[PDB]
Amino acid sequence: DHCARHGEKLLLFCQEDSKVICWLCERSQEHRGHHTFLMEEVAQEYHVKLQTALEMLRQKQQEAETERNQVAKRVPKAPPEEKEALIARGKALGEQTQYMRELISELEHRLQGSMMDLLQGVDGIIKRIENMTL
Ligand SMILES: [Zn+2]
Ligand SMILES: [Zn+2]
């Protein structure tokens, strides 16, 4: 809640860095030309954004899981090469679903947490979700 560098209240949010900082950090060279906001002034848009993302991710996950199940179902009836291909396919899908599970987990954590929980490093996860949807 307080800055380790300056001891002041961590109440500001930097748009370029997506970092939560104090007013003395904003005056540091590392935040030169950056635009800062009180965390209250930006919590809403990111709440909405992450909320929107979470839905999509959940949908994509359930789809991927059903697909994995179907792939698994084809395995026993398939000949050896196709078997192995299907096994690999299943594994890959598993990896994807694990990734989606991680992101979803993080999103719920952020959406149910404090503003600092919500905003600290949100740009990375937004990037990740953006890549995932692409
Ligand atoms: Zn500071
Ligand atoms: Zn900055």
Author numbering: 95 to 228
Task: Reproduce text from the manuscript describing this model.
TRIM5α is a restriction factor that intercepts the incoming capsids of diverse retroviruses, including HIV-1, and inhibits viral replication. Like all TRIM proteins, TRIM5α consists of an N-terminal tripartite or RBCC motif (RING, B-box 2, and coiled-coil domains), followed by a C-terminal domain. Higher-order assembly of TRIM5α requires the B-box 2 domain, which is thought to mediate three-fold symmetric interactions that connect coiled-coil mediated TRIM5α dimers into a hexagonal net. We therefore engineered artificial constructs – which we call miniTRIMs – that retain the integrated B-box/coiled-coil fold of the full-length dimer but are more amenable to biochemical and structural analyses.
A P212121 crystal contained two trimers in the asymmetric unit (3.26 Å resolution, R/Rfree = 0.26/0.30), a C2 form contained one dimer (2.1 Å, R/Rfree = 0.18/0.22), and a P1 form contained two dimers (2.3 Å, R/Rfree = 0.22/0.26). The dimer is quasi-equivalent to the trimer: the same sets of residues make the same interactions but with valence of two instead of three. The dimer buries a smaller surface area per subunit (450 Å2) compared to the trimer. Another distinction is that the first two turns of the coiled-coil helix are overwound and bent in the dimer form, which might indicate some structural communication between the interacting B-boxes and the coiled-coil domain. Interestingly, B-box dimerization is associated with local bending of the first two turns of the coiled-coil helix, as well as altered packing of the B-box against the coiled-coil domain. This suggests a potential mechanism of allosteric communication that can link B-box oligomerization and coiled-coil dynamics. In context of the full-length protein, assembly cooperativity drives the B-box into the trimer form, and so the B-box dimer might represent an intermediate state that can incorporate an additional B-box domain to form the trimer. Consistent with this interpretation, our structures indicate that the Bcc miniTRIM dimers can open slightly like a clam shell, which we imagine can lead to a wider opening and provide access to a third subunit. In principle, however, B-box dimers provide a means for extending the TRIM array in regions where the local assembly environment disfavors trimers. The catalytically active RING configuration is more structurally compatible with a B-box dimer, and it is therefore possible that the B-box switches its oligomeric configuration to facilitate enzymatic function.
